[PDB]
Amino acid sequence: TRDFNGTWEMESNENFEGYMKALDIDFATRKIAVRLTFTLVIDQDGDNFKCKATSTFLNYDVDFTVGVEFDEYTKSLDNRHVKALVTWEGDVLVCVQKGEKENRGWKKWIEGDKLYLELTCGDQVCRQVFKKK
Numbered sequence: 001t002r003d004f005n006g007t008w009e010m011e012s013n014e015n016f017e018g019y020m021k022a023l024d025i026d027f028a029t030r031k032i033a034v035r036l037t038f039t040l041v042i043d044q045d046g047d048n049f050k051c052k053a054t055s056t057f058l059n060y061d062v063d064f065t066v067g068v069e070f071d072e073y074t075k076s077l078d079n080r081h082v083k084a085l086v087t088w089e090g091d092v093l094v095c096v097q098k099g100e101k102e103n104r105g106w107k108k109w110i111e112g113d114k115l116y117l118e119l120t121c122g123d124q125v126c127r128q129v130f131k132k133k
Ligand SMILES: *C/C=C\c1cc2ccc(N(CC)CC)cc2oc1=O
Pocket: 038, 040, 041, 042, 050, 051, 052, 053, 060, 062, 077, 106, 108, 119
């Protein structure tokens, strides 16, 4: 299924620390953020998507159209400019963020009532799992 709509509660978070250090996130910010649980609210209509990821310390919003390149400024994270592109590989939603860092992006999919989000940067991979609220 290609339908990520809804509110998603984090159930599992693996190696968020390695991801954030690959982004060179500062120390005080990093080890507050590795404690946190996230909630995702996603609105998907065709190619149009809107994320909103929330926590008590770090929040992240992105809006994009699948198959349209867009410039992203990751002000809430590492404060870098990247050229982002989100496309479909089968039923997996794939984002590439062309920038200074190699292999930066994320992937995603639904595995029967659960949402999986994989964040990558350099040789680091963080895996997050959410349940549909
Ligand atoms: C997928 C749906 C878009 C959406 C993307 C997204 C990317 C990254 C994150 N992070 C929170 C830890 C990484 C900084 C969250 C997020 O949420 C979304 O809903």
